[PDB]
Design a protein around this nucleic acid. Structure first.
Lengths: 54, 276, 772, 99, 96, 103
RNA sequence: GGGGGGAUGUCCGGGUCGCCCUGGGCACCUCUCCCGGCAGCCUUCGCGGGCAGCCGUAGUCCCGGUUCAUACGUCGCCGCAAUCGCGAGGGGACCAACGGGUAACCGUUCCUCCAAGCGGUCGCCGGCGAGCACCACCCCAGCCCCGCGCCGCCCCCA
């Protein structure tokens, strides 16, 4: 990932970074996706997944 | 049917009479044609014919074959003479066995019809624009709407009142009111037995329920307390019509059978009363 | 023939989220202008929650999966729209169909348009806002000023500009007043009039040009479950301008569109609507609801705009997340892709009258490979490549020991975050190669110890890759069209063998002859990317085959003076009728030194080449396409792979299984039928009446059946120059079949992927709508 | 439960169970096999349990205990069933001496 | 199923409005090692007495007494006592 | 104790009968799951052959499809097996020989 | 299933020794008719009867691998009269069973006495309050959840 900033306390020293999304595709906002899934299953609950298992 | 012969309307009778088991023919009669016992053969169709009914005036009739519907448009207008009673008949397979059906007319004329079939499969198909689907070799696509509630056999589907609502009565003891303008279905759920026969009143105000355990109650619509009740002896019956649900080889097959004396007694201190 | 049935591979299915046809309808023509509408490239895109987008040809009911663009981890896709220009007419009246651009999202504040030739992300663009959720392009009424409209989380309608291969954030139209007004659905009533359906139970009709708020439609409380605010999930507009809107109580509203209010409220599903689709003349409405249900709508005839729910069905296994219509060139379908990863095609105009068809959820390329000498079976997905060993025969077992017979051998990881396109292996399995569209990596393996053999010269990354049988030549398809090769040199030392790759040497494909209006129209130079690459059994003749059906071959001129020359007979080698779905050398050598190239194209077109002659084999001269057996000819399964025997070639699509003794020659699904593009006609259970009979002659005797509607000398010479085939359906979901060793006896790995509720994402119910 | 036998459905009610659920139902049925006011229904539903979930007991030992513990109580229930009728004769057979 | 039959005997008081009210269910009116299927019942024309014969071999004579555990009388809210029937007499039957 | 053993052996006998049936159809090639080893599987379940008929809603009966039958066969296939095809099957004469893992 | 045949593969006496056979073991394919169910058509009001019937087993172009479920009428407080239960906590028996430990025994479950308190049901010629509104709208905090930055600790190499 990206290097975290080094603050002197007054200012901040960070490194620019755009070497992540080169020509492939942008990574999603996990938050936004979970929001969508929330809006889908607003209140409702899942059934048991499969069968006889710990 | 009431119909104009020359300028005089009267009652023609319309029967479906077999010639084999597998087929039958409909013959119509005047009073005087009945007196001479001769009739006008209108259509002989050939799949174990179940039923016939008839539209306003006598503009059309319907007959019920097992997979199929036989619809009869009269040919000429105005019925000038008695002999020109010819009906251009077309037939077509309903996707399931026809348990019953009920017509509704579309109007001094009859402009179209929409006729509803109900099937022991647990379905209720409705056909929407029949007269112009069928009046005009080639015709366009037709497709019933499928309205599916019951699991057992629908005993009776009838058009309602206005023609806004489709009511239904089944084995599962529950009278459904299909909304038909939305998708919804609102319904009277607890009857003492199978809903066997319903009819809609002259005005839309009353329903009649022949409850399969040999009774009848008249309802007002949307108040659903029975304003009228008449019951019968409620016993076990060797029924003439065999069944409505025994058409499709159900898991337990219905057999009209009797296996025990009908357990009963008379009451001392009230000899007018029998318990059974 | 020995067969190992293998389920144990856990190939992950993913949720289809997006479905995008290039066009929705074409203006109708007669059969006389079929040549006019012939060259219109019609494709269908589908996007999957692992960021997979894939390009399919409907192929006249063919449904060939052609191209897969993989997206990396934590990357997905949600919306998909093609951008097709109207047809340009040349100076000689020649026609140029629209260059079709294809746009998607990534659940972000970021649009990305996809280049299809280099087969990766053309462009990205990002206006500052929350997360883009729904988008579409302005329809036509200017001619070259057309724009994206995207609705996002926080509210602000953003307007994006696409002119002349550009993709840039033009401006913000407006944002909604409140901060909780989330946007979910978008569709265009007309040129200037956009419809968005939005979180607080509302349907906003905006005029885009000024950017003003023409009218606020509004929906009420969901009185089944709690959570008052209903959510419009999907809106479209009917071609005569009314608006239809599937929602969260599963209703479907008919909004009169002149005054932008309601006229009907239809109850369709139990749980919430998830997608709508419409016929292009405005007559068939398809509703797709989270209760894994599809319902189908036609007007109640007569009084105006009272629509009706003809019927519904439970089609998929999980819910139907998106579906899109298409109607034209004798084809009228709608594709519903859901979470159960199975695109189903539905016959739009033949509905209740024609069977639907489930496609395979599995990729058309078989994605399984093996080293039969090493007896190493393997496959791959996103970033993990898994390898098992079998360690044993079958006849040895000809029960209790099958558990130890199979063996999770290896599972290798790939650095970075790209997703893996293809991979190639040596026959002894010592050598491995991985093709991402950003890099290609070689791997040396030892019965285990691995090492990352390094590649130089690359760094731009490839879709296909093949290791030569002699383990000297590595050929990749980079940027789809640009095939490169390098030599690998095996240096033995006291520790063992190591391998060095040369510089990748580019070899050049042939400049075919194609009209420039064809080069410009449609998708452009899209078809050039090579579908398959096949070494000779001695690695002495290589061949490639692209999406257009062009095949290009190369020979090896030895003297390191080894170098591949163009085959001179490649000019003689012609381009196919359709997409070459399989192409391989026979391992069995010839007698004249030529090779024999087995070719099948997706139209069930079977043939074989003498490439050194640049002409067909004589057995192929004999056997023609109608000479094929009908179980082969009517299967509609896009034939996934071949395996070789001495005189036999066994074929496997997704479902069926075949074998052919190629030494010999040759002596239900109706063929005369003209259908809409999904499957064959109903024979028993349909809502339509199939036989309608009229009757004159009132005694019933006379009837009418009223219909329902809206190389002789070549075979002489081919016999003057002068079976064993078998098929079954009994292995249904086959992902891949690959031979293994230890009319010759052969073992083989059959590998299936049944779809399990354990595999699919989980179900969701409230207390109310519990299924039966 | 007696209604879910009156309508024959006790099969269908039982078949959709998982491990933890099966354990809880098992411990319950074991808890109430003793009281002859409802031993009929206890033993019937135990029959369906054994019929329907005796396959994975090699996989899960914890229920095997409860399976044993099910057996274990019943092992002591035939004895109570016999020890009753042991004295069961005695009480009836005094009754023939009194005349 | 023959093993798992239920056989209830239900004692009813007659409401002169043609209503039926329970007084007493008996769950196993003829018992042997299984519940015994009951053949028939009869009414003493003289007095309130009912009569049962079943699969065990015994005929049971049932009579209405008063629910009275130890002298106090259990009554419905009007004060009317909860009468209850009971097997008054028990006879085995000669078999040949 | 006689009652005890009458019980256990009536169990064993009925299981043995259904097992003989199952091995008969497995030798026939109906490709169910039979037990191999000298020890009783705990669940004495002999996976029955599929009845050619089905119980739809509401209470009606029809024929199974060949197709749905093949679906259930796919279900009954285990995780891993060997399916030896013979030349006679390739000739259309004989049937297959299958060995599934012990599940 | 039976009765039977034609053909597959097999051992034990075997046979000039080969085609296989008889005597014992047999499992299969094929044919046969009697078992069970299904459907049509003619017959008769019905009962029945006739007719030529399929299926009793396995794997598909796609594909029924579907369709399908019971209303409102009004909510809440406490009370009585019958009727049944859970038990906090305190205790016993150590029976059984399980997992360890040989075993000594431990631990878990099981059984049981007493019980603070506590529920549920049917009937009340019980009462007592309100019936959109547990909603529209805006704002402010809060829980659950989920996204990211910061620390705290702990890492390791240093």
């Amino acid at each position: 990932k990206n290097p975290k900033d080094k603050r002197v306390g007054s200012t901040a020293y960070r490194v620019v970074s755009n070497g992540g999304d080169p020509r492939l595709a942008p990574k999603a906002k996990k938050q936004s996706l979970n929001l969508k899934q929330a809006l889908l299953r607003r209140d409702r609950v899942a059934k048991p997944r499969g069968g006889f298992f710990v | 049917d009431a119909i104009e012969v020359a300028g005089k309307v009267d009652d023609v009778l319309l029967t479906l009479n077999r010639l084999t088991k597998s087929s039958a023919q409909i013959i119509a009669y005047n009073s005087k044609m009945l007196a001479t016992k001769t009739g006008k053969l209108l259509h002989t169709y050939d799949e174990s014919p179940q039923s016939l009914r008839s539209v306003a005036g006598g503009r059309a009739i319907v007959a019920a074959a097992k997979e199929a519907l036989h619809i009869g448009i009269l040919k000429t207008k105005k019925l000038a003479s008695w002999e020109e009673l010819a009906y251009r008949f077309v037939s077509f397979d309903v996707p399931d066995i026809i348990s019953t059906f009920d017509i509704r007319p579309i109007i001094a004329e009859l402009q179209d019809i929409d006729v509803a079939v109900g099937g022991a499969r647990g379905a209720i198909y409705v056909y929407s624009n029949l007269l112009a689907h069928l009046h005009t070799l080639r015709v366009g696509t037709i497709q019933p709407r499928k309205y599916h509630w019951h699991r057992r056999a629908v005993h009776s589907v009838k058009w309602s009142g206005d023609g806004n609502y489709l009511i239904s009565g089944g084995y599962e003891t529950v009278l459904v009111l299909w909304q038909l303008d939305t998708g919804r279905v609102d319904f009277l759920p607890h009857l003492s037995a199978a809903i066997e026969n319903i009819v809609v009143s002259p005005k839309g105000s009353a329903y009649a329920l022949h409850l399969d355990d040999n009774s009848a109650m008249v309802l007002s619509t949307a108040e659903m307390k029975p304003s009228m009740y008449v019951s019968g002896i409620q016993s076990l019956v060797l029924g003439d019509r065999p069944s409505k649900d025994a058409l499709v080889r159900r898991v337990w097959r219905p057999i009209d059978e009797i296996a025990s004396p009908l357990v009963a007694t008379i009451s001392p201190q009230n000899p007018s009363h029998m318990f059974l | 023939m020995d067969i190992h049935r293998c389920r144990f591979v856990r190939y992950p299915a993913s949720a289809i989220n997006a479905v995008a046809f290039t066009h929705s309808a074409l203006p109708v023509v007669s059969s006389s202008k079929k040549y006019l509408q012939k060259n219109i490239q019609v494709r269908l895109a589908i996007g999957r929650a692992n960021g997979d987008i894939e390009i399919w040809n409907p192929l006249n009911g063919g449904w060939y999966q052609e191209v897969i663009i993989p997206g990396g981890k934590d990357r997905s896709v949600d919306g998909l729209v093609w951008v097709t220009d109207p047809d340009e007419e040349m100076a000689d009246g020649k026609i140029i169909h629209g260059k079709s651009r294809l746009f998607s999202i990534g659940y972000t504040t970021t649009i990305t348009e996809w280049d299809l030739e280099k087969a990766r992300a053309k462009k990205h663009a990002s206006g500052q806002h929350g997360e883009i959720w729904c988008f579409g392009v302005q329809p036509l009424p200017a001619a070259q000023n057309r724009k994206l409209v995207a609705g996002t989380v926080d509210g602000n309608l953003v307007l994006y500009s696409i002119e002349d291969g550009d993709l840039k954030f033009q401006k913000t139209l407006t944002r909604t007043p409140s901060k909780k007004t989330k946007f979910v659905s978008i569709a265009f009533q007309s040129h200037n009039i956009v419809i968005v359906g939005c979180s607080n139970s509302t349907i906003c009709a905006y005029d885009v040009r000024t950017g003003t708020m023409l009218r606020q439609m509004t929906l009420g409380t969901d009185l089944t479950g709690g959570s008052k605010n209903i959510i419009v999930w999907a809106v479209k507009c009917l071609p005569n301008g009314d608006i239809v809107s599937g929602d969260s109580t599963g209703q479907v509203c008919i909004w009169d569109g002149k005054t932008y209010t309601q006229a009907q409220r239809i109850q369709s599903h139990t749980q919430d609507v998830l997608c709508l689709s419409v016929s292009a003349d405005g007559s068939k409405i398809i509703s797709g609801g989270m209760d894994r249900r599809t319902a189908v709508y036609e007007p109640m005839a007569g009084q105006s705009g009272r629509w009706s729910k003809v019927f519904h069905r439970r089609y998929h296994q999980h819910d139907v997340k998106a579906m899109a219509s298409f109607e034209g060139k004798g084809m009228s379908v709608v594709v519903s892709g859901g979470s159960d990863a199975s695109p189903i095609v539905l016959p739009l105009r033949a509905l209740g009258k024609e069977f639907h068809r489930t496609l395979p959820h599995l990729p058309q390329h078989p994605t399984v490979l093996s080293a039969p000498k090493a007896r190493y079976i393997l496959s791959w997905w996103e970033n993990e490549i898994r390898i098992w060993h079998l360690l044993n025969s079958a006849q040895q077992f000809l029960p209790l020991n099958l558990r130890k017979n199979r063996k999770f051998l290896a599972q290798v990881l790939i650095k970075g975050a790209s997703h893996i396109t293809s991979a190639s292996i040596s026959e002894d399995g010592t050598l491995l190669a991985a093709s991402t569209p950003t890099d290609v990596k070689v791997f040396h393996l030892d019965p285990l110890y691995i090492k990352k053999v390094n590649m130089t010269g690359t760094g731009l990354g490839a879709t296909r890759v093949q290791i030569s049988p002699d383990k000297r030549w590595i050929c990749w398809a980079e940027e789809g069209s640009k095939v490169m090769i390098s030599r690998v040199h095996a240096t033995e030392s006291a520790d063992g063998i190591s391998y060095t790759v040369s510089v990748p040497h580019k070899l050049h494909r042939l400049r075919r002859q194609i009209p420039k209006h064809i080069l410009l129209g449609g998708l452009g130079s899209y078809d050039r990317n090579v579908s398959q690459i096949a070494f000779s059994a001695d690695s002495r003749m290589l061949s490639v085959a692209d999406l257009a059906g062009y095949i290009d071959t190369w020979v090896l001129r030895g003297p390191a003076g080894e170098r591949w020359a163009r085959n001179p007979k490649a000019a003689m080698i012609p381009k196919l009728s359709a997409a070459p779905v399989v192409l391989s050398f026979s391992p069995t050598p010839r007698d004249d030194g030529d090779y024999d190239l087995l070719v099948v194209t997706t139209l069930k077109q079977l043939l074989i080449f003498n490439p050194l002659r640049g002409m067909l084999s004589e057995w192929s001269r004999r056997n023609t396409y109608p000479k094929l057996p009908e179980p082969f000819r009517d299967t509609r399964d896009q034939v996934k792979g071949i395996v070789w025997q001495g005189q036999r070639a066994w074929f496997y699509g997704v479902a069926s299984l075949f074998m052919f003794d190629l030494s010999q020659d040759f002596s239900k699904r109706k063929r005369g039928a003209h259908e809409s593009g999904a499957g064959s006609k109903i024979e028993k259970h349909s809502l339509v009446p199939q036989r309608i009979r009229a009757a004159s002659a009132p005694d019933g005797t006379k009837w009418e059946d009223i219909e329902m509607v809206d190389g002789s000398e070549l075979q002489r010479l081919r016999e003057e120059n002068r079976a064993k085939w078998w098929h079954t359906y009994q292995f249904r979901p086959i992902m891949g079949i690959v031979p293994i060793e230890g009319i010759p006896p052969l073992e083989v790995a059959l590998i299936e992927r049944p779809l399990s509720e354990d595999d699919l994402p989980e179900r969701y119910f409230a207390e109310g709508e519990w299924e039966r | 439960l007696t209604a879910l036998r009156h309508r024959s459905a006790l099969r269908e009610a039982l078949q959709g169970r998982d491990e933890l659920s099966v354990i809880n139902i098992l411990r319950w049925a074991g808890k109430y096999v003793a009281d002859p006011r409802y031993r009929s229904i206890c033993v019937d539903v135990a029959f369906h349990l054994i019929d329907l979930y005796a396959e994975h007991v090699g996989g899960s030992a914890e229920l095997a205990t409860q399976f044993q513990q099910l057996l274990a109580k019943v092992n002591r229930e035939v004895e109570k069933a016999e020890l009753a009728i042991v004295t069961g004769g005695m009480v009836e057979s005094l009754m023939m001496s009194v005349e | 199923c023959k093993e798992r039959r239920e056989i209830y005997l239900k004692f009813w008081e007659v409401g002169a409005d043609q209503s039926l009210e329970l007084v007493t269910r008996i769950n196993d009116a003829h018992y042997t090692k299984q519940t015994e299927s009951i053949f028939d019942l009869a009414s003493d024309p003289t007095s309130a007495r009912f009569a049962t014969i079943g699969n065990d071999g015994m005929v049971r004579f049932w009579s209405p007494k008063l629910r009275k555990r130890d002298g106090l009388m259990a009554t419905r809210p009007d004060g009317q006592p909860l009468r209850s029937w009971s097997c008054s007499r028990v006879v085995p039957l000669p078999v040949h | 104790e006689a009652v005890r053993l009458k019980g256990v052996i009536a169990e064993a006998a009925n299981y043995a009968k259904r097992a003989r049936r199952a091995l008969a159809d497995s030798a026939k090639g109906k490709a169910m799951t039979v037990h191999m080893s000298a020890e009783l599987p705990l669940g004495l379940k002999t996976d029955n052959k599929i009845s050619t008929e089905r119980v739809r809603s509401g209470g009606e009966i029809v024929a199974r499809s060949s197709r749905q039958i093949g679906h259930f066969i796919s279900k009954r296939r285990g995780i891993y097996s060997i399916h030896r095809i013979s030349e006679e099957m390739l000739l259309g004469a004989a049937g297959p020989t299958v060995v599934q893992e012990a599940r």
